[PDB]
Structure formats: C-alpha cells, structure tokens
From Swiss-Prot, chain A:
Function: Gamma subunit of the heteropentameric ligand-gated chloride channel gated by gamma-aminobutyric acid (GABA), a major inhibitory neurotransmitter in the brain. GABA-gated chloride channels, also named GABA(A) receptors (GABAAR), consist of five subunits arranged around a central pore and contain GABA active binding site(s) located at the alpha and beta subunit interface(s). When activated by GABA, GABAARs selectively allow the flow of chloride anions across the cell membrane down their electrochemical gradient.
Keyword entries, A-Z: Cell membrane, Cell projection, Chloride, Chloride channel, Cytoplasmic vesicle, Disease variant, Disulfide bond, Epilepsy, Glycoprotein, Ion channel, Ion transport, Lipoprotein, Membrane, Palmitate, Postsynaptic cell membrane, Signal, Synapse, Transmembrane, Transmembrane helix, Transport
Residues in compartment: Cytoplasmic: 234-239
Mutagenesis / variant outcome for changing R260W: In DEE74; does not affect protein abundance; decreases cell surface expression; decreases current amplitude in response to GABA; increases zinc sensitivity; accelerates deactivation
Positions annotated with a glycan in the UniProt record: N66, N184
Protein name (database record): Gamma-aminobutyric acid receptor subunit gamma-2
Species for this entry: Homo sapiens
Similarity section: Belongs to the ligand-gated ion channel (TC 1.A.9) family. Gamma-aminobutyric acid receptor (TC 1.A.9.5) subfamily. GABRG2 sub-subfamily.
Cellular-component GO terms for this entry: axon; chloride channel complex; cytoplasmic vesicle membrane; dendrite membrane; dendritic spine; GABA-A receptor complex; GABA-ergic synapse; plasma membrane
Gene: GABRG2
From Swiss-Prot, chain C:
Effect of R9P: In IECEE2; uncertain significance
Protein's cellular compartments: Postsynaptic cell membrane; Cell membrane; Cytoplasmic vesicle membrane
Record note on what altering V32I does: In IECEE2; uncertain significance
Expression sites by tissue: Isoform 1 and isoform 2 show reduced expression in schizophrenic brain. Isoform 3 shows increased expression in schizophrenic and bipolar disorder brains while isoform 4 shows reduced expression.
Name of protein: Gamma-aminobutyric acid receptor subunit beta-2
Extracellular side: 9-26
Role played: Beta subunit of the heteropentameric ligand-gated chloride channel gated by gamma-aminobutyric acid (GABA), a major inhibitory neurotransmitter in the brain. GABA-gated chloride channels, also named GABA(A) receptors (GABAAR), consist of five subunits arranged around a central pore and contain GABA active binding site(s) located at the alpha and beta subunit interface(s). When activated by GABA, GABAARs selectively allow the flow of chloride anions across the cell membrane down their electrochemical gradient.
Family, per entry: Belongs to the ligand-gated ion channel (TC 1.A.9) family. Gamma-aminobutyric acid receptor (TC 1.A.9.5) subfamily. GABRB2 sub-subfamily.
Entire-sequence positions represented here: 285 to 511 of 512
Quaternary structure and partners: Heteropentamer, formed by a combination of alpha (GABRA1-6), beta (GABRB1-3), gamma (GABRG1-3), delta (GABRD), epsilon (GABRE), rho (GABRR1-3), pi (GABRP) and theta (GABRQ) chains, each subunit exhibiting distinct physiological and pharmacological properties. Interacts with UBQLN1. May interact with KIF21B. Identified in a complex of 720 kDa composed of LHFPL4, NLGN2, GABRA1, GABRB2, GABRG2 and GABRB3.
Transmembrane residue ranges: 27-47, 60-80
UniProtKB/Swiss-Prot annotation, chain D:
Entry comment, domain topic: The extracellular domain contributes to synaptic contact formation.
Protein's UniProt name: Gamma-aminobutyric acid receptor subunit alpha-1
Effect of mutating D38N: In EIG13; the mutant protein is partially retained in the endoplasmic reticulum and has decreased expression at the plasma membrane; causes decreased current amplitude in response to GABA compared to wild-type and alters receptor gating kinetics including faster desensitization
Quaternary structure and partners: Heteropentamer, formed by a combination of alpha (GABRA1-6), beta (GABRB1-3), gamma (GABRG1-3), delta (GABRD), epsilon (GABRE), rho (GABRR1-3), pi (GABRP) and theta (GABRQ) subunits, each subunit exhibiting distinct physiological and pharmacological properties. Interacts with UBQLN1. Interacts with TRAK1. Interacts with KIF21B. Identified in a complex of 720 kDa composed of LHFPL4, NLGN2, GABRA1, GABRB2, GABRG2 and GABRB3. Interacts with LHFPL4. Interacts with NLGN2. Interacts with SHISA7; interaction leads regulation of GABAAR trafficking, channel deactivation kinetics and pharmacology.
Transmembrane segments: 73-93, 99-120, 131-152, 170-189
Keyword field: Cell membrane, Chloride, Chloride channel, Cytoplasmic vesicle, Disease variant, Disulfide bond, Epilepsy, Glycoprotein, Ion channel, Ion transport, Ligand-gated ion channel, Membrane, Postsynaptic cell membrane, Receptor, Signal, Synapse, Transmembrane, Transmembrane helix, Transport
Residues exposed to the Extracellular side: 121-130
Family: Belongs to the ligand-gated ion channel (TC 1.A.9) family. Gamma-aminobutyric acid receptor (TC 1.A.9.5) subfamily. GABRA1 sub-subfamily.
Effect of Q88L: Reduced potentiation and activation by the agonist alphaxalone
MF term (GO), any: transmitter-gated monoatomic ion channel activity involved in regulation of postsynaptic membrane potential
Length: 333, 106, 80, 193, 104
C-alpha cells in the first residue's frame, strides 16, 4: 500500500557506501547481546564457542520518514541496501551467521531515522588459557569486537545499561566449567590503520572438579596403595614382589601418559602432572626399597627386618602429608 | 482417545468468592485445552483458547493454567451472570470434551 | 584376549547386538578362561591326590583341541 | 526442536500446525539412522516467549529416545564381572603359591583400572557420576578387597595358620554372595526406572 | 599472479616495521627466534614476477619432551639395572624384570 511508497522514497538518492554523517561527526552505535549458550571450552585449542543475538542500533537521518506508522519492521531483504557498520570480532578464530531457512537478520527503521539491525552469530572465540593450577584453575576470557575500516573518528561503539543478558545458563554445554558472571569494557587500540574503539565482554568461568578427580587422581592414589600392599608380603617371595613393582610402574607410566594427553602440550609443569610425578616417585621408591631390603637380607637380616616395619609406617604418613600440603596449597592458590 | 476428567461435577458458591475448576487429561495434551462457557438455552462460547489465553471479549476475572495433563480454570470476583456450564476440551488430538460443571449460586 | 576384543570393537560403531566376530572372540575368551580355571582346579586338588591331577591334565590335553575344533567347525559352518 | 520467526513478532506472524497437532510431525517408517538409541514418539507444543525485541511464537517438538544397553553390557559389564571372577579365583589357590596369588591380584587391579579409563572415554567430559561409574567403582572395590584379603592371609601364614585357613575358607563364600547381592540390587533398581 | 615485473612492483612499507605483532605471538611448543623480510623476483615460463617472503625461525621447546619421554626411558633403564642386585639364584625375578623393561 503506502509502505511501499515509503520504502521507495527512502531508497531514492541513497548511497550505501557512505556512513551517516560521513563528514560531520562519528556514528554512535549502541550494541546489545543475548547469549544463548556458551559452548565447550576446549583447552587444547585455547578456544571456546559462543552463540549470540548481536543487536546494533544507530541513527541515519536519511532513513527518516513522516507517516502514521511509527516503525517499519522488515526482514533481511533490505539489509543489503542501506548502510550497515562493519563490526568484526577481533579474537574470533572462526565465526559465521545463520542462513536456514532464511538469513537470520532483522531490520527495524523507526520514524526519526533510528535503525535497529539484529543478527544471529556463532563465534569460536579465542582465549589463551593459563593452564597452571590445572585442574584447579579459573579463567575469565573475553569476546572483543570493533569496526574494521572505520577508526575512532568515524565509528564509536557504546554499551547500553542492560546490554548483555545471558539466557538460562542450565542447558549450556559448559561441562568442566561453570558460569559465574560477566562484565563489559571499552578501550581504544592503535593499529597501522588508525585508532579503533574496541569493546569487550568478559565471561567468568570456574573449572568444577569432577571428571579429573575420578579420571586420574583416584586411579593414581589407588595404584600407590597397591604398591604399598607389597610391604606386607613376606620378603622371601622375590618374584611376587618384583612383579608387583614392575607392573605397578608400568600402570603408573601409562596413567601419566594418559593424564598428560588430556591437556595440550605445554612446556611448564602443571598441578596434575606434578601429582602423577609424585605418585611415580612413591612407587619407584617402594620398589628400590624392596630391592635394598632383599640385598640386605643376605648381609644383615636385622636391618632387612626392621626396614619393612619402618616403611609400613613411613610410607602412608608421607603420602598423607604430601596430599594435605598439595591440596591445601592449590585450593588456597 | 484422550478422555478429560473434569471436577467437580457441580459446585454451589456465593457471589464474590474465588472459585477453581480442574480438568485432568488422560494422555499428553501440551497446551491445547480450551474452556467453553455454555449458558442455558445457548451455544458454548470459547473462554480460554490454549491454556491461559483469554479470548477476545472475556473479562479479566477468568484465568487459565496449563500443564501436560492437569489444567485449571480460576474465576476471581464471581458476578451474578457467571452461572453456566463450563466444559474443558482438548485439541491436541481429535477433540474430546469433558462432562462440564454446573456452577450454582447459594 | 580381552584387549584384542576391545581394540577390535573400537573400529566399529556402538552397535547393540552381537556380531559374528564378537561371538568368535567370546568363544576364544571362554576357552582361555576355562584353561586357567582347569589349572586352578588341578592346583586345588593337587596335594590330596596327584594322580587325579595328572589324569585331569591328560584329559585336558586331549579334549581342549577337540572341543575347540568342534566349536570352530560349527561356527564356520553356521556363518559361511 | 524449537522453530519460530525472526524479525516478526506475535502481532504479525503466528504459527500453527496444519493438521491436528498430534498428526503434524510425521516420521517415516524406514527413516531411522539411529544405531544406538530407539525413537519412541514425537510430542509437539506451541508457546510464546518474551524477549528484549518482542513477543514471538515458538513451536516445539520433542523426540523421545531410549538408549540401547547391549553394547555397553558387552564391552563394560561383562569385562568387569569377568575380572571380578578372575580375582576371586585367587582364593582357591593354596597358600604355598604366593607369586600366583600376587599376580592374580595385581593384574586384576590393573585390568579394572584400564577398564574404568576406557569406560569413561565414551561419554562427554561430565562432572558427575553415572550408573556405569558406580558399577565400576564397586567392582574395583571388590578386586582391591580380594587383594587385601590375600595380603592378610599371607601375613598370618606361618604364624597362625589356623586363622589364615579360616579367613580364606570364609572369603571363598563371602565374596561371591556379596557380588551376587550387589548385582541383583544394582540391576533391579536401575531397570525398574 | 597475473602481472609480471614490468607491470607491478612489490615492496614492504618501512622494510622493518612492515610486519608487526610477532613478539606477542605465544606458541605452546615453539618459540619465534626471529623473522626476515626478503624481496626478490622469480622467473617462470611466462615472465618474471615480484615476490616477498616472510620467514619465521621457530625453535622447539624441550621441557615437555624431557618430562614426557626422556625421563621414563632413564627410569626404565635404571629399573633394568636393579636386577643386578638380585642374586643369580632367583631366575624368575631377573627374567621378569629384564623382559618387562625390554617390552616397555
Ligand atoms: C572464492 O570463491 C568462493 C566461491 O565462489 C567465494 O565464496 C562465495 O562468496 C560469495 C560472496 O561472498 C557468496 O555469495 C554470497 O553469499 C551470501 C550468503 O552466503 C551464505 O549462503 C551461501 C549460500 O547462498 C545461498 O543461500 C543464501 C541464504 O539462503 C541465499 O541468500 C543465497 O542467494 C543462496 O541461495 C541459493 O542457494 C541456496 C542453496 O544454498 C538455495 O536454497 C536458494 O534457493 C538459492 O538457490 C553459503 O554458501 C555461504 O557460506 C559460505 O560463505 C560464508 C561467508 O562467511 C563462509 O563462512 C562459509 O564457510 C561458506 O564458505 C553463506 O552461508 C549471500 O547473501 C550473497 O547474496 C547477497 O549479497 C550480494 C552482494 O551484496 C547481492 O548482490 C545479492 O543480491 C544478495 O543480496 C540480496 O539478498 C540479501 C539477503 O541477505 C539481502 O539482504 C539484500 O538486500 C539483497 O536482496 C536484494 O536482492 C535479492 C535477490 O538477490 C532480492 O530477493 C531482494 O528482494 C533484494 O532485491 C552472496 O550470494 C557465496 O555463497 C560463496 N560461496 C562459497 C561456496 O563459499 C569466496 O568469497 C571467494 N574468495 C575470495 C577471496 O574471493
Ligand atoms: C570348554 C569351553 C567350551 C566353550 C564353548 C564355546 C562357548 C561359546 C560362547 C559364545 C559367547 C556367548 C554367545 C552369546 C550369544 O549367542 O548371543 C546371544 C544373543 C545376544 O542377544 P542379542 O540378540 O545380540 O541382543 C540384541 C537384540 N535384542 C537386538 O538388538 O535385536 O544373540 C543371539 O542369540 C543371536 C545370535 C545367535 C548366533 C549363534 C551363533 C552360534 C555359532 C556357533 C557358536 C556356538 C557353538 C558352540 C559349540 C560349543
Ligand atoms: C576379563 C575381561 C573379559 C572381557 C571379555 C568378556 C566377555 C564375556 C564372554 C563370555 C560369554 C558371555 C555371554 C554373554 C552373551 C552375549 C551378551 C549380549 C548382551 C546383549 O546384547 O543383551 C542386551 C540385554 O542387556 C541386559 O538386559 C543386561 C541386563 C543385565 C546384564 C547382565 C548381568 C550379569 C550379572 C551376573 C552376576 C554374576 C555374579 C556372581 C559371581 C541387549 O539389550 P538391548 O537394549 O540392546 O536390546 C534388548 C533389550 N534388552
Ligand atoms: C551387596 C554388597 C555391597 C558391597 C559393595 C562394596 C563392597 C566392596 C568390597 C566387598 C568385598 C567382599 C568382602 C568379603 C570378605 C569377607 C571374608 C573376610 C574373612 C575374615 O574375616 O578375615 C578378614 C580378611 O580380610 C579381608 O577379607 C579383606 C578385606 C579388605 C577390606 C576392604 C577393602 C576395600 C577396598 C577399598 C579400595 C578400593 C576402592 C575402589 C575405588 C580379616 O579379618 P580378621 O583379621 O579379623 O580375621 C579374623 C576373622 N575370623
Ligand atoms: C551367587 C553365587 C553363588 C555361588 C556360591 C559360592 C560358594 C562357594 C562354593 C561352595 C562350596 C563350599 C566352599 C568351601 O570353601 O568349601 C570347600 C568345598 O570343597 C569342595 O569340594 C569345592 C566345592 C566346589 C565349589 C562349588 C561351586 C558353587 C558355586 C572346602 O573348603 P576347605 O577350606 O575345607 O578346603 C580345603 C582347603 N583347600
Ligand atoms: C555495561 O556497561 C555499562 C556502561 O559502561 C555499565 O553501566 C554503568 O554501570 C555503573 C555501575 O553499575 C554506573 O555507575 C554507570 O552509570 C553505568 N553507565 C551507564 C551508561 O549506564 C554496566 O555496569 C556494564 N555492565 C557490567 C559491567 O556488567
Ligand atoms: C612373579 C613371577 O613369578 C613371574 C612369572 C610370570 C611373570 C609375568 C609374565 C608376563 C608378564 C607380562 C608383562 O607385560 S607388561 O605389558 O605388563 O610389561 C609384564 C610382566 C609380567 C606380568 C610378568 C611379571 C613376573 C611374573 C609374574
């Protein structure tokens, strides 16, 4: 009817290559979000997936009409005919919009030129996780976006008061972590092209313990007590105790290999490989202890007999001590 | 065949007090339960299409409450012209109505 | 045996029924387990009467290959 | 499976099923690429979600599934149960053969460890304990208890052989009945649901 | 691709500040020692074309390898050596130890 006339009058003499107020003042863009789900935080690639509803609203004095209708509600068929800011996410490894069934976009042009442009995005953002204190580690890693070609003198972004609003936080694929909060931030960065206004949203993730507790800690402590079980078998049965030691060492090295294969290749010492190394040391020390015991039985049975009962008390106490220290320290750190 | 057990069969209540009616479905009916008000010598009139959505022209004292099987029709300040039958009927499958509740004044 | 059955079952999807190769591996595992439990039987009754032990060993030597060949033949005739 | 409109609120575009809502979502007879699960039935529903932009109509469709337990039985529960049996075999061996019982115990503990690891790999990296996890934990406890019992027997051997023979003859009956009772309880309380 | 060296000329802008952001790159396994910027010409059957080259020199870290596969080798060889303290009368213990170490 008459909405066709309005849309035709708005696009007569319109150049979608020139930002609104190209030579007057910067274009103020208000950005809002709606986090559907924060995807899996895989530490191997130092990335995490997020799915949002990115909304941008700005003023365009050229899309200003005067009729009884207050707002024009349009689908994605008129997005490619007006000016649209070139917002890109600076720390996204790979991100893409949605196209099924129709491009997921929305365009609402109000009466005074105010434009609202909303689209659906799935961003595989990047964040370099400091994998110390693993798996007792907490991260807070961002999602940054800015204009690509327009410097600070042309496009200025600005958060709204109630900009970022998370969803239910229950049907998210955050397995090992747990959402605790967020905060928005605005800064200005320097590039070879110019000065850009970079906005950021920090998501706070806390690694919940569990999978690792039952995947590596319990197996290794149970292997350690298995190695302690050798201290009660009589000292005359050599092959039994040697088999104990060597098979325990084999399982210990297999479990250490698996545990380190869990997280990526890092050249520093984490808190999990330290634990498996201490357990390895314990098992190796029990085996060399039995070796010296058997060697001393031929020399002085006195020391070979006293050593067994000494170790029976010295090993579990030293392991309790190690555990206590380790756990308390890391839980406070 | 989905059967709708509507309760109670007939209640008598005075003017101005809150009243509630229940309609329990046998199988699953998501929110496709409708409430009709049939006055004597008249045709049923749709009150609540879907669960908890008043029809155009229905006073705000009628409210629906939906679930998978149990549904409720609550009337607030009950007036003097609300003395009629109240049928509940699902539509998730081929429509089957309830027995209805004869509301009375005393 | 158990590690061959698990590694082989890692190359296929999580199929809920018993394939033919699974049946063969489970028969081979039963034969191995029975051999171990026959050594344990011998070890148990050894001190009380070694004659029955040497006898059981002869009977085992004679009748593990026979039963295994019979199972193998019925298997390769039921599936082929 | 929730689908709605983009850019069109409820005052503009309302969705509705074309047939009776129970007969709208149809599934083909031969259309089942499910090898692990078992599709039971569909269930549709229509609601309205509020938002920051407007009120939208949202159509929902749940496909009810039911996991098939055959593969997990074959590859976790049988190896666990067999390892436990192989562990309890160590009680019928004589007390003079120490290396044999030591090998039994150690190898059964190693087998249970590797079984736990291989059983936890199939699932997502979830932070709570599943039913299979409880079963594997109980089997681990049984094998470890068998090893501890053998160690106690060996400790009392050559000093109080009567007590050693007593606890061995008692553990030849206490472990299998306890494992059977645990199996009955576990399977009964987990198959009724 | 299309234009030979008498149609186009490539050069770095600044010749040492043309490439930035290298010192901030953190790699989990390697370490950027340095980088060079080269400007040359290649000759194909169709003409002589301009070319630039950005050549990093990654040096691999060694800590992870020590902790992952050098230490276990040394400990397995030492576990093999312990078999020398066992007396030669026990033939089921030294065979066990040595054989297991070989397999490992
Ligand atoms: C190296 O070579 C590569 C291969 O050649 C090349 O990649 C190609 O790049 C081009 C350009 O970048 C891509 O073409 C664009 O694609 C945009 C969207 O792309 C998404 O979808 C395509 C598939 O496209 C189908 O689906 C969309 C969504 O439904 C449709 O809109 C398309 O028309 C098309 O539909 C046909 O095909 C469907 C089957 O898929 C059918 O169902 C359908 O019926 C049609 O037959 C995907 O392939 C894309 O994925 C790839 O790209 C992403 C990019 O991020 C990658 O991440 C990803 O990994 C993949 O690689 C992606 O998912 C189109 O929107 C776009 O068309 C619009 O823009 C142009 C330019 O502005 C306009 O001229 C054009 O008219 C369109 O604008 C109209 O429509 C929009 C809708 O949003 C309106 O807003 C707009 O106002 C305008 O409306 C006006 O015109 C309409 C008619 O057009 C009219 O109806 C309106 O009323 C109004 O008047 C363009 O097609 C191409 O897909 C890439 N191909 C591949 C294989 O990657 C690469 O860039 C090269 N590299 C370099 C360095 O050069
Ligand atoms: C001394 C030691 C002696 C050792 C002897 C040798 C010992 C052999 C031990 C075989 C190992 C156990 C076999 C189990 C078994 O047979 O599995 C039964 C059933 C399982 O249930 P499911 O149907 O898979 O569950 C999913 C289902 N609900 C769905 O999803 O549809 O499957 C069947 O019955 C169908 C297949 C039968 C084929 C028989 C081949 C015999 C070949 C020949 C093999 C048997 C020959 C025996 C000869 C001794
Ligand atoms: C040492 C490592 C050894 C590794 C290798 C060992 C392999 C063993 C080989 C020996 C022979 C074993 C015989 C097993 C026969 C085949 C098994 C097929 C299982 C199967 O597919 O059945 C599922 C049923 O599960 C169920 O319903 C299961 C319910 C209960 C499970 C069994 C409980 C055992 C308890 C035993 C107690 C003994 C303790 C006392 C000492 C299918 O089910 P579906 O869902 O796919 O379709 C059907 C609806 N059900
Ligand atoms: C429905 C069942 C539900 C149960 C679920 C979980 C149960 C798991 C463990 C149960 C195993 C069965 C235990 C049956 C043993 C009974 C026979 C014992 C004979 C006996 O009395 O002698 C004792 C022998 O020690 C022994 O028998 C050694 C016992 C070892 C202690 C337990 C070790 C647990 C392992 C923990 C680590 C693994 C955790 C896994 C993550 C020492 O008694 P005495 O010196 O007084 O002799 C004088 C007594 N006439
Ligand atoms: C659900 C699981 C139900 C299974 C119950 C398992 C019960 C174990 C077997 C029952 C036989 C008694 C066990 C027992 O210790 O008595 C032994 C029976 O001897 C014999 O003749 C061996 C009995 C053969 C075991 C029967 C298998 C039943 C399963 C002799 O004991 P002892 O200490 O006097 O022997 C001399 C030391 N070498
Ligand atoms: C998102 O950004 C806005 C704008 O920077 C923050 O809003 C400010 O909040 C502080 C404290 O709550 C107030 O003192 C300011 O007046 C607010 N400014 C505006 C323009 O509203 C908001 O706190 C940020 N959200 C976070 C950090 O979660
Ligand atoms: C104590 C004894 O009297 C001897 C007699 C039989 C021996 C075992 C024969 C084979 C193997 C498998 C080998 O596999 S491995 O992958 O774990 O390295 C590890 C070592 C192990 C368990 C021997 C340990 C020592 C014995 C138990």
């Amino acid at each position: 009817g008459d909405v066709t006339v309005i849309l035709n009058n708005l696009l007569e003499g319109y150049d979608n290559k020139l930002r609104p107020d190209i030579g007057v003042k910067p274009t103020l863009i208000h950005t809002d979000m709606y986090v559907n789900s924060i995807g899996p935080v895989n530490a191997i690639n130092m990335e995490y997936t997020i799915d949002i509803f990115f909304a941008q609203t700005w003023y365009d004095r050229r899309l200003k009409f005067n009729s009884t209708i207050k707002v024009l509600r349009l689908n994605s068929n008129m997005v490619g005919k007006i000016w649209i800011p070139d917002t890109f996410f600076r720390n996204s490894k790979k991100a893409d919009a949605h196209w099924i069934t129709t491009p997921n976009r929305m365009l609402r042009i109000w009466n005074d030129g105010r434009v609202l442009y909303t689209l659906r995005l799935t961003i595989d953002a990047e964040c370099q996780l400091q994998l110390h204190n693993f798996p007792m580690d907490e991260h807070s890693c961002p999602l940054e976006f800015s204009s690509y070609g327009y410097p600070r003198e042309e496009i200025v972004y600005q958060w709204k008061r109630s900009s970022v609003e998370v969803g239910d936080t229950r049907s998210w694929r955050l397995y090992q972590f747990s959402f605790v909060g967020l905060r928005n931030t605005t800064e200005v960065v320097k590039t070879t092209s110019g000065d850009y206004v970079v906005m950021s949203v920090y998501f706070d993730l806390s690694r919940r313990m569990g999978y690792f507790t039952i995947q590596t800690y319990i197996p290794c402590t149970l292997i350690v007590v298995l190695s302690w079980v050798s201290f009660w078998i009589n000292k005359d049965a050599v092959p039994a105790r040697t088999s104990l030691g060597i098979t325990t060492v084999l399982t210990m090295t297999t479990l250490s290999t698996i545990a380190r294969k869990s997280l990526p290749k890092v050249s520093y010492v984490t808190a999990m490989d330290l634990f498996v190394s201490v357990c390895f040391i314990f098992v190796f020390s029990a085996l060399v202890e039995y070796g010296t015991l058997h060697y001393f039985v031929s020399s002085q049975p006195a020391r070979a007999a006293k050593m067994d009962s000494y170790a029976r008390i010295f090993f579990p106490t030293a392991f309790c001590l190690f555990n206590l220290v380790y756990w308390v320290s890391y839980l406070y750190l | 065949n989905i059967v709708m057990t509507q309760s109670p069969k007939s209640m008598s209540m005075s003017v101005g007090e809150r009243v509630t009616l229940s309609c329990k479905a046998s199988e699953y009916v998501g929110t496709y339960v409708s409430w009709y008000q049939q006055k004597p010598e008249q045709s049923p009139k749709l009150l609540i299409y879907g669960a908890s959505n008043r029809y155009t022209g229905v006073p705000d004292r009628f409210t629906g409450s939906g679930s998978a099987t149990d549904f409720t029709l609550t009337i607030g300040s009950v007036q003097a012209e609300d003395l009629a039958d109240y049928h509940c009927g699902q539509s998730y499958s081929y429509p089957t109505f309830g027995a209805g509740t004869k509301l009375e004044l005393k | 045996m158990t590690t061959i059955n698990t590694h082989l079952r890692e190359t296929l999807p999580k199929i809920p029924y018993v394939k033919a190769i699974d049946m063969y591996l489970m028969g081979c595992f039963v034969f191995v387990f029975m051999a171990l439990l026959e050594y344990a039987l011998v070890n148990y009754i050894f001190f009380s009467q070694p004659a029955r032990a040497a006898a059981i060993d002869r009977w085992s030597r004679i009748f593990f290959p026979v039963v295994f060949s019979f199972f193998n033949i019925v298997y390769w005739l039921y599936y082929v | 499976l929730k689908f709605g409109s983009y850019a069109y609120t409820r005052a503009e575009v309302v969705y509705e099923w074309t047939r009776e809502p129970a007969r709208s979502v149809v599934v083909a007879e031969d259309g089942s690429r499910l090898n692990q699960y078992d599709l039971l039935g569909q269930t549709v529903d229509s609601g309205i979600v509020q938002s920051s932009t407007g009120e939208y109509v949202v159509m929902t469709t749940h496909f009810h599934l039911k996991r098939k337990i055959g593969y997990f039985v074959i590859q976790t529960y049988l190896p666990c149960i067999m390892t436990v049996i192989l562990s309890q075999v160590s009680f019928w061996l004589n007390r003079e053969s120490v290396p044999a019982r030591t090998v039994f115990g150690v190898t059964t503990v190693l087998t249970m460890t590797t079984l736990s690891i291989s059983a936890r790999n199939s699932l997502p990296k979830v932070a709570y304990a599943t039913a299979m996890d409880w079963f594997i934990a109980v089997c681990y406890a049984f094998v470890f208890s068998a090893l501890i019992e053998f160690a106690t027997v060996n400790y009392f051997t050559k000093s109080q052989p009567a007590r050693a023979a007593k606890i061995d003859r008692l553990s030849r009956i206490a472990f299998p009945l306890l494992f059977g009772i645990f199996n009955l309880v576990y399977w009964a309380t987990y198959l009724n649901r | 691709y299309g234009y030979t060296t008498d149609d186009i000329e490539f050069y770095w802008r600044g010749d040492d500040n043309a490439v930035t952001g290298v010192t901030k790159i953190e790699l989990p396994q390697f370490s950027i020692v340095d980088y060079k910027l080269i400007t040359k010409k290649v000759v194909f059957s169709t003409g002589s074309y301009p070319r630039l080259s950005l050549s990093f020199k990654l040096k691999r870290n060694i800590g992870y390898f020590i902790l992952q596969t050098y230490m276990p080798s040394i400990l397995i060889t030492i576990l093999s050596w312990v078999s020398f303290w066992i007396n030669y009368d026990a033939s089921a213990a030294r065979v066990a130890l040595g054989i297991t170490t070989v397999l490992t």
